[PDB]
Design a protein around this ligand. Structure first.
Ligand SMILES: CC[C@]1(O)C[C@@H]2CN(CCc3c([nH]c4ccccc34)[C@@](C(=O)OC)(c3cc4c(cc3OC)N(C)[C@H]3[C@@](O)(C(=O)OC)[C@H](OC(C)=O)[C@]5(CC)C=CCN6CC[C@]43[C@@H]65)C2)C1
Ligand SMILES: CC[C@@H](/C=C(/C)[C@@H]1C[C@@H](OC)C[C@H](O)C(C)(C)[C@@]2(O)O[C@@H](C[C@H](OC)[C@@H](O)C(=O)O1)C[C@@H](OC)[C@@H]2O)CO
Ligand SMILES: C/C(=C\c1csc(C)n1)[C@H]1C[C@H]2O[C@H]2CCC[C@@H](C)[C@H](O)[C@@H](C)C(=O)C(C)(C)[C@@H](O)CC(=O)O1
Ligand SMILES: Nc1nc2c(ncn2[C@@H]2O[C@H](COP(=O)(O)OP(=O)(O)OP(=O)(O)O)[C@@H](O)[C@H]2O)c(=O)[nH]1
Ligand SMILES: Nc1ncnc2c1ncn2[C@@H]1O[C@H](COP(=O)(O)OP(=O)(O)CP(=O)(O)O)[C@@H](O)[C@H]1O
Ligand SMILES: COc1cc2c(c(OC)c1OC)-c1ccc(OC)c(=O)cc1[C@@H](NC(C)=O)CC2
Ligand SMILES: Nc1nc2c(ncn2[C@@H]2O[C@H](COP(=O)(O)OP(=O)(O)O)[C@@H](O)[C@H]2O)c(=O)[nH]1
Ligand SMILES: [Ca+2]
Ligand SMILES: [Mg+2]
Ligand SMILES: [Mg+2]
Lengths: 429, 439, 332, 54
């Protein structure tokens, strides 16, 4: 039932805020936490993400963390910034300097217990807490280093709850900072061991979509983040709205993750169409379905045609006949059955929800668990070793007390993870 | 007076259960508040419907039923439905966290904490019985609760209620009818450990029920409500012997007596006819010969398989409505000649026939048209092994890679339980092959 | 487009058909254990029929009829002809035969042996089974069935066959029949004669068995065109009048008999199958059924056309893609 | 084709038409299997909490 949400660092707080902004609009909540909705379908499951305060006020079950105040003020002074519980702001002053070691071991060490206190206070207010969700980037210092420290501490207090993260991978196409492959590799190591489900949101993929597909010549984080919030709303539809699915996070993990370490998901969203003459066409289910599976629509920069899907979850939203959706989804599998492993029968599932996202008559959200995600970890691995071969920029991390061995076993873990994906790409029945 | 207690486990069992009790009430004249004006014995009585309903001093007729689910969503419906006033709160049992489509979680982790409470509520009902003959248990194969908890319950029921009969109504998984990818695991796990603890199991393939709805009822995308109201007709005609004055199958033990020669091969096939659509205004009335015939066409069976390539060990024809014996023998005379009905050489080639003069009831506003006569055929044929072979193959594909296996091991089940269940299924398949082969 | 999988590697005929399918650019082969297939060219034995027709959204068709083995097993054919009322134990085109176990008919066979030996009649019998690729004494045949741990059929040996001249040689006739998913019975216009180069001597196991395995004309095979001219010149008759009417009639009676048992009308998957019928022709131009083959090979010359015919009426009939070498044997 | 065992009642009748002649564990056991599963679970939890303490 209840989910506790944590956003850490600049990126995590940025996309975390847009997420609450978007789903608040869907559930008919205004920026002061009052309900102004029509359908009651919007309150059926409102308690999943919102706490009910005195006076018919719904407040997000959200914890906001950062090692510097800047983004705290930014969120607090924005649209839907007043909706958040004021106790649930936990920030420092030092900042992490895009340094994983500062977030994970030195500066974050002091703030971490304050966060666990708010986490603990929210968990005890839950009827039956099902688990946690974290938004953060892997390329920085706070969301990457301190976000993973939070995951580790939270898992130790709630060892049987589901742990789920929306994790933004770094790309040289978007960001300037040379040490990002270092931060990401240390983070991936923590994620393979302490999360149950991780959505891989690749800034490299988000950039190609905005630049190539959407024709945005000067992409901003606001553009990228509006893709992320749309996808985050889509993948959480079946938690926040009733209908045909009696599903929570654990059931999703059980049916999406056939092997413990292989829990990194490839997300996608339809529709995506550049401005503007095509923005007025009516979307048909056949078109939604082809777009959803198109490699160029994927939100992790990896070619799904290079590998195989272990499992797929697809969710459609809006007014549409389920018969059309059924036929179309079966068409994709029957006509391209070599891209789905045959040792997992009937391994693509569909859910349809009546309420559509704001601004769209229809939409589809894609959750793919594909062996091709290895391309993402290979890319980060290449950048890592090019630098680590010569111990370049290592002093920023050893000056915080870290050893070289810790880097060696992080790259080691990621290389094995790559190997594991490769072995089911060639596994046959 | 011999009573029967129904236990409904998991979403499927509770929703199918809700459909059955609604149908029973329409069939006996019991209203949604528990009163039946046609009952002249207030507070008691030794009538046939009393094997499924107890009576309160106030004149209310309570179902002899128990509802269990490990999460309250589905049972809350029953708690607020048309027939909420007919149940006691003590008959509705809900947890807070479900089995997550995970057998090991339903059987071992969550099951351990709730089994004694369920047994205590069942015990309360058995105490109100003077001649309790056994249990009818409804549950899916694929659910974590339906597979995992039902198994624990069956094992327990043998202990506390040894020698009492246990009958099963089981929903066989079908991708058509929304299936999780691990339902093949749950199905083999629960069949293996329940096999020794039920005396007769009525399997319903969601794929078969789905096609009847689309083909005969003209329903583009059947809902659970469509599936569940059709399943209710079959259950109602199977149990109609226990709830009505009759002579065929008056006691649960007669089901195995009449239908299960071999203990392990206790899965009779159900065929039902006619399924006519209520929208259809014409309503051409079929003869007993026509509907008897339909029982031998594959498209009317509860499991998709081909009985022409198997052997029968028992066959029962259960008619409802406007049916005279003279017509039945005449139909069997014909059916024999124009049909391939091979019995095993150790059993006699014959048919047990029951006739209930009361015709099938329909839920007002359902999808089925009211008919003058209907048949439900129960046959123990080896053709049903086809459903086990399908299921075992899907199991093997995943198990060869140990896919999803860690979810069950992490709940405290040991990996060995998998291959022990699979070997049992291999044996069950050898059993069917031996009973109906000749080369 | 459409998808198919190959599960019998050895099939010379379906090895060919799958090449025509690929040649259309509208079919694709997908491994063996992948279940999202439109067509399954299945294996000879233990074909998992129970797995077909269950994949959502896939019209599945298979190249074998579940149940047609009853017609294609020596032992079961003899039992089917005698027990089925539409064929009768007096069926005038099947040689007298009995099933003998090394249900048994060894007591009934000996009764029909002394009834003939006493009657002073030709009593040459052939004995065979379904595990192999002729005598006048019962004491010599029954001890043979015992030295072989397999069930055998003892069938009356056709003592007075029709012989070809020049050569005074024996032969049999092979007909190819195709049954589609609608149970149309299609007879392939072209047949083959399995000739024996060795002259026939009714008093040596080469001039009696005519199949190509044991062995004038190339490949000991004569085609209908030639055999037709021979009947015209030698006997003043035609192939259609004196032989093909009986062949057409035998083929209908056998397949019409088992249709209620094997028909896939109203089944969740569809079936078709190519059969081989083996016939004998005696001195009086009477045709005898020898055996029915469920997995026949084809004459090397006739692999095309017949295989192209299989895709035309059997496969493309249910999966249409963007003359007639068959004779529709009208039935029902 | 013979008819036998004809029973006639108020709400129907029954009979048999013949065509051709013919030619457990204890409560202890269960609770030991359940407690054993609880053992393996607790052992796994200890391996996780131990690895996290490191
Ligand atoms: C989505 C957030 C983003 O706005 C994305 C880009 C970068 N930054 C901020 C804004 C920005 C951009 N360019 C800037 C130049 C000066 C100051 C600021 C900018 C941005 C753009 O043009 O649209 C707004 C941009 C940036 C780049 C950018 C594209 C881009 O917008 C299209 N490139 C992908 C890289 C780049 O390194 C590259 O690989 O070549 C294409 C690229 O190189 C060249 C020769 O263009 C370039 C351009 C300054 C060079 C050196 C540093 N790298 C980092 C990323 C890259 C840039 C957009 C963050
Ligand atoms: C589905 C498995 C795995 C790859 C395959 C095989 C998928 C199949 C289907 O996916 C929508 C494509 C579909 O059948 C079409 C051909 C009609 C189509 O939509 O293809 C895309 C081009 C796409 O480029 C990426 C293609 O290469 C691709 O992704 O193919 C536009 C256009 O091309 C002509 C065409 O309209 C992706 O999950
Ligand atoms: C493609 C879209 C809609 C659409 C497709 S066909 C139709 C009638 N409408 C949606 C997609 C939404 O998921 C959200 C992400 C889109 C990002 C945009 C905000 C983007 O930054 C911007 C440049 C745009 O593309 C538009 C503002 C033109 C946007 O309205 C169209 C779009 O992509 O939104
Ligand atoms: N016919 C029918 N099948 C159902 C129904 N509900 C679920 N099923 C089927 O049962 C399987 C899922 O089992 P459920 O009963 O939903 O699960 P559960 O017993 O609640 O188990 P958990 O939720 O995992 O604890 C799937 O194959 C569904 O298609 C129903 O009302 N009718
Ligand atoms: N009843 C019979 N009378 C006379 N000759 C017979 C006969 N049955 C079989 N033969 C001869 O034996 C040959 C083999 O026929 P049989 O039915 O045994 O085939 P087979 O299964 O052994 C090999 P194939 O499948 O290639 O025909 C025939 O071609 C014929 O020459
Ligand atoms: C709460 O949200 C979801 C929860 C689940 C699923 C899912 O995808 C449809 C969701 O997101 C829409 C789901 C996913 C994948 C499956 O197989 C890969 C499966 O068998 C099964 C499922 C779900 N069950 C069904 C029948 O779809 C249960 C878990
Ligand atoms: N998609 C997206 N990525 C962001 C955003 N802000 C920062 N990033 C990325 O996050 C990484 C830097 O981490 P950041 O969150 O700034 O650092 P932190 O505050 O120390 O956690 C780089 O790869 C940035 O491109 C944002 O709003 N959206
Ligand atoms: Ca009474
Ligand atoms: Mg920053
Ligand atoms: Mg449930």
């Amino acid at each position: 039932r209840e989910i506790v949400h944590i956003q850490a660092g600049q990126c995590g707080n940025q996309i975390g805020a847009k997420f609450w902004e978007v789903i608040s609009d869907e559930h008919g909540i205004d920026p002061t936490g009052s309900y102004h909705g029509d359908s009651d379908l919007q309150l059926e499951r409102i308690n999943v993400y919102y706490n009910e305060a005195t006076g018919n006020k719904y407040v997000p079950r959200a914890i906001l963390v950062d090692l510097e105040p800047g983004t705290m003020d930014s969120v607090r002074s924005g649209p839907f910034g007043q909706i958040f519980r004021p106790d649930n702001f936990v920030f420092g002053q030092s900042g992490a300097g895009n340094n994983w070691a500062k977030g994970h071991y030195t500066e974050g060490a002091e703030l971490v217990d304050s966060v666990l206190d708010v986490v603990r206070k929210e968990s005890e207010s839950c009827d039956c807490l099902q688990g946690f969700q974290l938004t953060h980037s892997l390329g920085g210092g706070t969301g990457s280093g301190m976000g993973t420290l939070l995951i580790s501490k939270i898992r130790e207090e709630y060892p049987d709850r589901i742990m789920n993260t929306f994790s933004v991978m770094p790309s040289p196409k978007v960001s300037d900072t040379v040490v990002e492959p270092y931060n990401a590799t240390l983070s991936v190591h923590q994620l393979v061991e302490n999360t149950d489900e991780t959505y891989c949101i690749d800034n490299e993929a988000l950039y190609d979509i905005c630049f190539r597909t959407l024709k945005l010549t000067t992409p901003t984080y606001g553009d990228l983040n509006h893709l992320v919030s749309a996808t985050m709303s889509g993948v959480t539809t079946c938690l926040r709205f009733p209908g045909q699915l009696n599903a929570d996070l654990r059931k999703l993990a059980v049916n999406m993750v056939p092997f413990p370490r292989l829990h990194f998901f490839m997300p996608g969203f339809a529709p995506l169409t550049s401005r503007g003459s095509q923005q007025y066409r009516a979307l048909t289910v056949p078109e939604l379905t082809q777009q959803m599976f198109d490699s160029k629509n994927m939100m992790a920069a990896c070619d799904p045609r290079h590998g195989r899907y272990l499992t797929v979850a697809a969710i459609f939203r809006g007014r549409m006949s389920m018969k059309e959706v059924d036929e179309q989804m079966l068409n994709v599998q029957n006509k391209n059955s070599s891209y789905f492993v045959e040792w997992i029968p009937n391994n693509v599932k569909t859910a349809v929800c009546d309420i559509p996202p704001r601004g769209l008559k229809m939409s589809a959200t894609f959750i793919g668990n594909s062996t091709a995600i290895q391309e993402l970890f290979k890319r980060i691995s290449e950048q890592f070793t090019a630098m680590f071969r010569r111990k370049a920029f290592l002093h920023w991390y050893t000056g915080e007390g870290m050893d070289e061995m810790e880097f060696t076993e992080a790259e080691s873990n990621m290389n094995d993870l790559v190997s594991e994906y490769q072995q089911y790409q060639d596994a046959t029945a | 007076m011999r009573e029967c207690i129904s236990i409904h486990v998991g979403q499927a069992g509770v929703q199918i259960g809700n459909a059955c009790w609604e149908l029973y009430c329409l069939e006996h004249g019991i209203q949604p508040d528990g009163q039946m004006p046609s009952d002249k014995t207030i507070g008691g009585g030794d009538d046939s419907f009393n094997t499924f309903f107890s009576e309160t001093g106030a004149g209310k007729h309570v179902p002899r039923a128990v509802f269990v689910d490990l999460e309250p969503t589905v049972i809350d419906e029953v708690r607020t439905g048309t027939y909420r006033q007919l149940f006691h709160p003590e008959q509705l049992i809900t947890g807070k966290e479900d089995a997550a489509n995970n057998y090991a979680r339903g059987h071992y982790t969550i099951g351990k904490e709730i089994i004694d409470l369920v047994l205590d509520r069942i015990r309360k009902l058995a105490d109100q019985c003077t001649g309790l003959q056994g249990f009818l248990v409804f549950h899916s194969f694929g659910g974590g609760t339906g597979s995992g908890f039902t198994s624990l319950l069956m094992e327990r029921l043998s202990v506390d209620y040894g020698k009492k009969s246990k009958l099963e109504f089981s929903i066989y998984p079908a991708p058509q009818v929304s299936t999780a990818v691990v339902e093949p695991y749950n199905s083999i796990l629960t069949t293996h450990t329940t096999l020794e603890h039920s005396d007769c199991a009525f399997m319903v393939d969601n794929e078969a029920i789905y096609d009847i709805c689309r083909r005969n009822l003209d329903i583009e995308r059947p809902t659970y409500t469509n599936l569940n109201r059709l399943i209710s007709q079959i259950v109602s005609s199977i149990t109609a012997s226990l709830r009505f004055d009759g002579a065929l199958n008056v006691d649960l033990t007669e089901f195995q007596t009449n239908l299960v020669p071999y203990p392990r091969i206790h899965f009779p096939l159900a065929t039902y006819a006619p399924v006519i659509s209520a929208e259809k205004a014409y309503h051409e009335q079929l003869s007993v010969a026509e509907i008897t015939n339909a029982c031998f066409e594959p498209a009317n069976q509860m499991v998709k398989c081909d009985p022409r390539h198997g052997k029968y060990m028992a066959c029962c024809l259960l008619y409802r409505g406007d049916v005279v014996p003279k017509d039945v023998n005449a139909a069997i005379a014909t059916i024999k000649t124009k049909r391939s009905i091979q019995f095993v050489d150790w059993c006699p080639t014959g048919f047990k026939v029951g006739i209930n003069y009361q015709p099938p009831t329909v839920v007002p506003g359902g999808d089925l048209a009211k008919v003058q006569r209907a048949v439900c055929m129960l046959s123990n044929t080896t053709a049903i092994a086809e459903a086990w072979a399908r299921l075992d193959h899907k199991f093997d594909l995943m198990y060869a890679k140990r896919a999803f296996v860690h979810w069950y091991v992490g709940e405290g089940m040991e990996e060995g339980e998998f291959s022990e269940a699979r070997e049992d299924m291999a044996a069950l398949e050898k059993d069917y092959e031996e009973v109906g082969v000749d080369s | 487009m459409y998808t198919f999988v190959v599960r019998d590697e050895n099939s010379s005929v379906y090895a060919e058909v799958s090449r025509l399918l690929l040649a259309t650019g509208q079919w694709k082969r997908l491994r063996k254990d992948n279940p999202r297939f439109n067509l399954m060219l299945g294996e000879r034995n233990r074909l998992p029929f129970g797995r077909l027709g269950h994949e959502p959204g896939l019209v599945q068709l298979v190249n074998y009829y579940r149940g047609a083995d009853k017609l294609c097993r020596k032992a079961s054919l003899v039992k089917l002809i005698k027990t089925s009322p539409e064929l009768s134990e007096s069926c005038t085109w099947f040689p007298e035969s009995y099933v003998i176990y090394p249900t048994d008919e060894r007591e009934v066979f000996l009764a029909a042996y002394n009834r003939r030996r006493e009657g002073r009649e030709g009593n040459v019998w052939i004995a065979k089974s379904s595990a192999g690729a002729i005598s006048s004494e019962a004491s010599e045949l029954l001890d043979f069935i015992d030295e072989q741990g397999q069930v055998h059929v003892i069938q009356k040996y056709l003592e007075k066959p029709l012989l070809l001249e020049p050569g005074h040689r024996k032969f049999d006739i092979r007909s190819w029949v195709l049954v589609d998913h609608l149970y149309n019975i299609y007879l392939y216009r072209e047949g083959v004669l399995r000739t024996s180069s060795e002259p026939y001597n009714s008093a040596d196991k080469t001039c009696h068995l005519t199949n190509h395995c044991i062995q004038y004309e190339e490949g000991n095979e004569m085609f209908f065109e030639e055999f037709n001219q021979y009947l015209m010149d030698a006997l003043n008759t035609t192939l259609e009048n004196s032989i093909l009417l009986q062949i057409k009639h035998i083929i209908r009676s056998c397949l019409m008999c088992i249709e209620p048992a094997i028909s896939t009308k109203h089944l969740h998957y569809q079936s078709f199958q190519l059969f081989g019928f083996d016939f004998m022709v005696d001195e009086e131009l009477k045709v005898w059924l020898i055996e029915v083959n469920g997995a026949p090979a084809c004459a090397q010359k006739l692999y095309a056309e017949l295989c192209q015919g299989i895709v035309d009426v059997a496969i493309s009939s249910v999966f249409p893609l963007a003359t007639s070498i068959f004779i529709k044997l009208h039935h029902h | 084709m013979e008819v036998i065992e004809l029973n006639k009642c108020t709400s129907g009748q029954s009979f048999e038409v013949i065509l051709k002649p013919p030619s457990d564990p204890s409560l202890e056991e269960i609770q030991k299997k359940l407690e054993a599963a609880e053992e393996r679970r607790k052992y796994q939890e200890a391996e996780l909490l131990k690895h996290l303490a490191e």
